[PDB]
């Protein structure tokens, strides 16, 4: 079973967005879908549901009138209309499914995406990278990274020598510059005895600027 | 609306404790009760569904419990992997609600960081900003002090600090400190230092650098 959440990112007070919710492996028909939040360090807030057959919905106060749940039975597809955005409705949105016909617990979510709602603009990480110490102990444990500077908004996704290496690994949450800009970085430690021999690179990916940088972190 | 009120807010127990967590549902909610875990960044997964019955998938160690309105999901004993943010819900009526979550934190033996230092690159020294990283890796508590010295001279306002959640291995932490600097700014010194200040060290470490 899949659920995977589209058409969410940056949008500007009062202004509309459009979220999808693409199902696999099961019939839409078959089950209430849920669109439930999360707010930055916050929890759980259900915000709405469908039954796809007939499409009888339910919404919650905070969001009843503004947004609108709907579904398209051809693609296996769920829709949240949402308009008049403000700096509440600022959060994750998972998009899940109840089980069958009495077992109605939410068995399965999607990853969730990121709502931002600034009109603030867009705008594209820098990547430098944070190379292993010459005195690299004689033989024992190094670390090395990639700073990752001044993007807007969340998220960014950081993967090591593509998907190849993850023991180690610490993307540290990302710190907000008096700026109004984002940064964060990523580090790896690893056996001093491999610097020059194996190659550490690291992929940056942020989709709001459609940006894909695969720096090669070398000593020095 | 239900209302459901979560205890705790917050736990750390060891590696091989039952922990236990309430839910107390406002009015009556049958056997109508889901208990998910959350891990950082993941979405929540399943565990509990209709209070006793434990999800597909879902190691036995887990188990939940209906005494009237109070719920009860239990971790028999502790693994490292069980670190998240645990919510109960009550789906009996629309809104199906959420108490506001459990935080379990792991807890093992005090564990020194290991501190490294890296210069600002060259390639953004070009573009006139230096930024310095001391980085902490696997300590534990969670709880530390970085201080940064320019030349001997302690420093304030001018660095950012990020700490990781848990690892759900070792149940260590690690974290990132940077001080930021006008290459103008950077260029006018050449120590750079960051003392470190955490209980697995019976004396602070400095990490240092002569700027060349």
């Known amino acids: 079973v899949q659920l995977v959440e589209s058409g969410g990112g940056l949008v500007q007070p009062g202004g509309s967005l459009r979220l999808s919710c693409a199902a696999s492996g099961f019939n839409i028909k078959d089950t209430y879908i849920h669109w439930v939040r999360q707010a930055p360090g916050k929890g759980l807030e259900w915000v709405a549901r469908?039954?796809?057959?007939?499409?009888?919905?339910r919404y919650a106060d905070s969001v009843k009138g503004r947004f609108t749940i709907s579904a398209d039975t051809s693609k296996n597809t769920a829709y949240l209309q949402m308009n008049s955005l403000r700096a509440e409705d600022t959060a994750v949105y998972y998009c899940?499914?109840?089980?069958?016909?009495?077992?109605?617990?939410?068995?399965?979510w999607g990853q969730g995406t990121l709502v931002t709602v600034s009109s603030a603009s867009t705008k594209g990480p820098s990547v430098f990278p944070l190379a292993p110490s010459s005195k690299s102990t004689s033989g024992g444990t190094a670390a090395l990274g990639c700073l990752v500077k001044d993007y807007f908004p969340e998220p960014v996704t950081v993967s090591w020598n593509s998907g190849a290496l993850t023991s180690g690994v610490h993307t540290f949450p990302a710190v907000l510059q008096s700026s109004g800009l984002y940064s964060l970085s990523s580090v790896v430690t690893v056996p001093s005895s491999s610097l020059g021999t194996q190659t550490y690179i690291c992929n940056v990916n942020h989709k709001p600027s459609n940006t894909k940088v695969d720096k090669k972190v070398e000593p020095k | 609306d239900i209302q459901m009120t979560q205890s705790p807010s917050s736990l750390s127990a060891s590696v091989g404790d039952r922990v236990t967590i309430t839910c107390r549902a406002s009015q009556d909610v049958n056997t109508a009760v889901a208990w998910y875990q959350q891990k950082p960044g993941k979405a929540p997964k399943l565990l509990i569904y209709?209070?006793?019955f434990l999800y597909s998938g879902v190691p036995s160690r887990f188990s939940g419990s209906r005494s009237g309105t109070d719920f009860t999901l239990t971790i028999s004993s502790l693994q490292p992997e069980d670190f998240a943010t645990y919510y109960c819900?009550?789906?009996?009526?629309?809104?199906?609600?959420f108490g506001q979550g459990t935080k379990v934190e792991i807890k093992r033996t005090v564990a020194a960081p290991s501190v490294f230092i890296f210069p600002p690159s060259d390639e953004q020294l070009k573009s006139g900003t230096a930024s310095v990283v001391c980085l902490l890796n696997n300590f534990y508590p969670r709880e530390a002090k970085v201080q940064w010295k320019v030349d001997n001279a302690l420093q304030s306002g001018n660095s950012q600090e990020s700490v990781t959640e848990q690892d759900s291995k070792d149940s260590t932490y690690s974290l990132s400190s940077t001080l930021t600097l006008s290459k103008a700014d950077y260029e006018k010194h050449k120590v750079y230092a960051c003392e470190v200040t955490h209980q697995g060290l019976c004396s602070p470490v400095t990490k240092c650098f002569n700027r060349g």
């Open positions: 209709s209070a006793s």
């Open positions: 469908i039954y796809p057959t007939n499409g009888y919905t």
């Open positions: 819900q009550q789906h009996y009526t629309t809104p199906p609600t």
């Open positions: 899940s499914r109840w089980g069958g016909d009495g077992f109605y617990a939410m068995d399965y």
